[PDB]
Amino acid sequence: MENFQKVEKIGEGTYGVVYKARNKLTGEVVALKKIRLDTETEGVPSTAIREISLLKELNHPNIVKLLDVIHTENKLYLVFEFLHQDLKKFMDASALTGIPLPLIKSYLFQLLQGLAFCHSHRVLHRDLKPQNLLINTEGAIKLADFGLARAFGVPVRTYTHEVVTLWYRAPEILLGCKYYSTAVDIWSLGCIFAEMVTRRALFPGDSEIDQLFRIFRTLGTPDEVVWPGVTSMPDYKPSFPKWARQDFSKVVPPLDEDGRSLLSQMLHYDPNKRISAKAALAHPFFQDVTKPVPHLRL
Amino acid sequence: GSPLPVLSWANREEVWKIMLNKEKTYLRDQHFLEQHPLLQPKMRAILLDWLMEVCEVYKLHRETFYLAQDFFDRYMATQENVVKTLLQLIGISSLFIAAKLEEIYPPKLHQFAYVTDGACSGDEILTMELMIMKALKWRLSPLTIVSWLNVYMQVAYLNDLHEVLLPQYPQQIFIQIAELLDLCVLDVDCLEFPYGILAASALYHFSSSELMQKVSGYQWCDIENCVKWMVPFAMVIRETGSSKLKHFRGVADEDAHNIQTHRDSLDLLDKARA
Ligand SMILES: C[C@@H](NC(=O)O[C@@H]1CC[C@H](c2cc(NC(=O)c3cnccn3)n[nH]2)C1)C1CC1
């Protein structure tokens, strides 16, 4: 740790601070996640051990790269690829004019490519929100901050409950499901898709019950027909009010027919029926962005 | 071949091939103790067996024990000239890393020092965990021996719905096959065989080649060498019978088979090699 000059503090979390830094020899800029080990009673944080090991096996163009892990002076430096803005600030900056539809489509397509790569590697992100999606000046967007991520087994067992930031948290989590996997990330991405379209958070709840009721008021109060097993879930109540599902021409006015269809399938109540990242890439909403590859049948 | 059914969330052949390609990044060496001439293969068995007891006391998952086993073996392959007294520190620090990776609420650092009966301070463990993780290049996500058994048990009980992520299989036969694997893992010669082969061979001994191939993808020729090696261990378990499924306080019963257990496996390991 000598050739890097700290340039600007860009973030701060529980176990570390993120800096923008610049190699003085090459002119290369990176992001440094610093972890002061002297303050950590449990040694290297579990969230850091997980993120490092996960990202060392998740090399993809739409995943922010971990470049190096450097241990020096009771400190741990994680060296990352640097991107100059997150989607949250891009959406706020675009709030008056709107993000152009071809750019929403390109960003969603890339996010589904990165998520499909995570899921095929049996990794759940579990904290997809606009502040964790980074963009560069070349039209790319990338998944970032894997500190809450987890590898899942085939089959899974019970994992940490009450994951995902509240506004992006899937209804099966809010209702206390015993098992979960890839569908929680797709729900978050569907929330984010609608947020790019409307420039407003789709479900901005302030509590777990307010979050669940905001979902119910938009997508209808689910029942056994649309979500088998919903009435047997730990946090389900028969006293939930019955709201009628709203027409997506009013939920997402700017969205065309293919967009409304894709969003509906990403916000399916049943996690077993909710569209997968791989299938979403094949949706006709992207029929112009991508062409299908021939499939062997053997 | 791949035993996984069609996956709604990815190409089944893609997921399986990533899992298979994973076992090329993760190398093992059945003869890594030749890099440490002052160590015997028996010391590894006693250390691993001790870690197993530690896991049951704190109700840590089988996956946590096998991560600690894998971290230990791979770290030793990168080192040279280690002595007896350093083994307990390397082992418990492997288990510390493993618990922090796998458990929702892992035990605290001082508890890992507490079980060494003072031979390992918390500061020693924190120094050792960084040495281990750096020497392993932070490759801390192997497919353990027990993770393969988990896959094999799901496929054996695949319904027509072909849901592969929601666990569904008898807990009783799972812990019985895990018991054969826990014994074999004490013998360092097991590293000759890939972790997926080891688990498939243990399953074969409790069923058939047809079921084995159906759920693992490997042909009889792929595992015959492993099966012939596992032969003495399998019969030792058969002579004494298989254990019963336990209940653990504060552990949901649908997770009860996933808790590591301990039995006097060292004397049963001695009842072999002949
Ligand atoms: C704080 C972050 N925490 C985290 O874990 O991020 C990973 C480690 C550092 C990596 C990273 C961050 C970055 N740039 C910015 O965040 C930025 C720069 N200027 C303006 C606005 N934003 N480029 N690369 C990825 C969340 C954003 C994800």
Side-chain angles (χ1 to χ4, degrees):
Chain A
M1 266 296 170
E2 176 189 356
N3 263 316
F4 284 148
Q5 177 179 338
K6 282 171 182 174
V7 169
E8 171 191 350
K9 178 178 173 177
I10 56 190
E12 178 168 16
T14 280
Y15 293 115
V17 173
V18 185
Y19 302 89
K20 170 176 180 173
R22 187 185 142 278
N23 190 283
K24 288 155 291 188
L25 279 188
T26 71
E28 174 182 356
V29 300
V30 299
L32 294 176
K33 181 183 290 190
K34 176 187 183 174
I35 297 175
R36 275 156 42 80
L37 300 176
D38 33 294
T39 326
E40 304 298 334
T41 46
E42 301 301 316
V44 186
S46 64
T47 59
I49 310 191
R50 275 179 191 183
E51 174 170 30
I52 291 162
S53 60
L54 290 179
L55 289 180
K56 284 197 104 67
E57 314 216 356
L58 287 179
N59 204 84
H60 191 268
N62 299 107
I63 299 179
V64 181
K65 270 201 57 189
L66 173 65
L67 307 173
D68 202 9
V69 177
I70 303 176
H71 175 43
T72 170
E73 200 231 26
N74 240 356
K75 278 139 48 184
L76 202 67
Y77 278 106
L78 285 61
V79 186
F80 288 89
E81 172 191 13
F82 175 77
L83 298 84
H84 82 317
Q85 197 176 49
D86 59 85
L87 180 62
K88 179 63 180 176
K89 301 192 313 149
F90 182 74
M91 298 158 123
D92 294 351
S94 309
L96 303 177
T97 60
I99 301 160
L101 176 58
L103 188 60
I104 295 182
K105 181 174 302 191
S106 166
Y107 279 172
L108 181 71
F109 187 77
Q110 295 174 59
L111 294 173
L112 290 162
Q113 291 180 291
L115 197 55
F117 188 87
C118 294
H119 290 174
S120 72
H121 284 64
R122 293 152 62 254
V123 175
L124 312 175
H125 188 279
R126 306 188 307 177
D127 196 25
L128 291 166
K129 51 186 182 173
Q131 22 279 109
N132 282 340
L133 308 177
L134 305 179
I135 66 178
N136 65 12
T137 60
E138 305 180 329
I141 185 170
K142 310 199 180 198
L143 305 189
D145 196 356
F146 279 69
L148 291 179
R150 200 211 170 92
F152 66 89
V154 184
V156 312
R157 69 172 198 266
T158 292
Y159 299 143
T160 299
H161 60 108
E162 305 183 49
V163 284
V164 192
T165 298
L166 186 56
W167 292 1
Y168 306 95
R169 185 178 307 166
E172 61 267 22
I173 307 302
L174 296 164
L175 288 177
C177 60
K178 203 215 308 300
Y179 304 122
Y180 64 82
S181 62
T182 57
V184 302
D185 288 337
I186 293 292
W187 178 276
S188 300
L189 237 52
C191 288
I192 294 177
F193 180 20
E195 192 169 336
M196 287 189 286
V197 172
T198 68
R199 278 95 77 243
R200 297 176 298 105
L202 186 59
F203 301 128
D206 58 8
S207 70
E208 287 188 52
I209 191 57
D210 183 69
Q211 182 74 24
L212 192 77
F213 285 2
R214 284 182 184 274
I215 299 167
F216 290 179
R217 292 200 333 108
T218 301
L219 299 177
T221 301
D223 55 17
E224 280 293 334
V225 174
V226 321
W227 185 356
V230 67
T231 68
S232 310
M233 300 189 70
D235 303 320
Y236 178 88
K237 313 291 189 59
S239 65
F240 289 161
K242 304 306 189 182
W243 294 280
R245 181 188 183 95
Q246 298 177 357
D247 196 298
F248 272 25
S249 299
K250 313 195 310 299
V251 175
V252 276
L255 220 46
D256 54 72
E257 166 186 353
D258 292 336
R260 292 191 316 262
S261 164
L262 170 61
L263 183 61
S264 297
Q265 302 179 243
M266 297 171 86
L267 299 177
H268 209 293
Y269 270 123
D270 189 339
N272 296 323
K273 297 296 196 178
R274 193 176 304 151
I275 193 166
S276 75
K278 188 180 180 73
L281 293 170
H283 197 271
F285 186 62
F286 309 108
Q287 70 184 300
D288 52 355
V289 179
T290 182
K291 234 57 183 178
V293 305
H295 290 337
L296 173 71
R297 294 183 175 181
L298 235 179
Chain B
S2 176
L4 301 178
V6 294
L7 306 180
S8 64
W9 43 280
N11 180 16
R12 41 170 299 274
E13 288 291 343
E14 186 182 32
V15 168
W16 184 253
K17 261 144 185 59
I18 295 166
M19 292 172 64
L20 295 184
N21 183 42
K22 156 97 64 174
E23 238 148 73
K24 301 179 178 61
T25 318
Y26 284 84
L27 286 75
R28 285 90 194 195
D29 195 339
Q30 63 263 37
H31 294 130
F32 71 81
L33 286 176
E34 293 175 352
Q35 307 181 352
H36 314 259
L38 212 58
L39 302 183
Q40 298 159 353
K42 179 59 178 299
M43 313 177 191
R44 180 181 170 277
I46 303 175
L47 174 70
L48 290 184
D49 185 67
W50 171 69
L51 295 177
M52 269 187 265
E53 199 161 352
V54 173
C55 292
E56 187 179 19
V57 172
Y58 292 83
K59 308 172 192 300
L60 305 181
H61 289 80
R62 305 182 179 273
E63 171 71 12
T64 302
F65 162 70
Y66 273 96
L67 286 172
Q69 167 267 321
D70 182 66
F71 296 166
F72 172 79
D73 291 334
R74 281 195 291 122
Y75 171 76
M76 289 307 205
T78 76
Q79 298 305 309
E80 294 183 12
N81 300 125
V82 179
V83 84
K84 280 180 175 178
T85 56
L86 195 57
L87 293 175
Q88 184 173 14
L89 173 58
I90 298 173
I92 201 57
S93 302
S94 298
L95 189 56
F96 186 46
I97 304 162
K100 276 190 294 177
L101 282 164
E102 196 61 41
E103 307 293 344
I104 295 179
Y105 300 109
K108 291 302 186 297
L109 165 67
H110 82 279
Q111 304 181 265
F112 280 88
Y114 171 69
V115 296
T116 74
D117 199 52
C120 301
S121 63
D123 277 337
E124 277 181 320
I125 296 182
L126 302 188
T127 306
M128 189 72 247
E129 77 153 355
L130 282 167
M131 293 189 282
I132 293 184
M133 292 188 296
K134 283 151 54 166
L136 295 178
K137 305 301 178 184
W138 301 85
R139 295 308 207 281
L140 306 171
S141 307
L143 298 182
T144 60
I145 296 172
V146 72
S147 73
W148 285 108
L149 177 57
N150 188 44
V151 183
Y152 298 168
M153 288 299 304
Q154 185 72 14
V155 181
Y157 284 91
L158 273 181
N159 308 321
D160 203 3
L161 291 77
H162 287 342
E163 183 53 52
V164 86
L165 292 189
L166 205 149
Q168 184 272 322
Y169 51 80
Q171 320 185 284
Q172 184 115 278
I173 106 152
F174 177 90
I175 72 104
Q176 293 177 359
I177 301 169
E179 180 181 7
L180 171 55
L181 291 167
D182 292 342
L183 182 66
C184 301
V185 81
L186 301 181
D187 193 313
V188 205
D189 286 321
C190 75
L191 293 183
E192 176 187 341
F193 317 108
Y195 287 169
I197 291 291
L198 276 172
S201 305
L203 169 92
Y204 162 80
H205 278 100
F206 285 91
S207 45
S208 64
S209 61
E210 294 77 16
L211 184 79
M212 176 281 310
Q213 187 172 7
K214 165 176 169 188
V215 318
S216 77
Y218 307 145
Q219 303 180 348
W220 170 249
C221 54
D222 302 350
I223 76 169
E224 178 179 6
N225 204 30
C226 188
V227 165
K228 188 173 70 172
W229 168 82
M230 191 169 288
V231 157
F233 312 94
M235 269 304 110
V236 170
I237 308 296
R238 287 290 189 201
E239 291 185 34
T240 183
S242 48
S243 299
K244 294 282 186 178
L245 170 64
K246 294 183 174 181
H247 165 67
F248 299 93
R249 259 185 285 99
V251 177
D253 278 325
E254 44 258 311
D255 196 57
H257 64 296
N258 284 322
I259 306 305
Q260 182 67 47
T261 55
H262 181 260
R263 170 255 252 277
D264 202 70
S265 303
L266 284 168
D267 93 294
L268 301 196
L269 184 80
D270 303 336
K271 296 147 129 170
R273 96 183 242 87

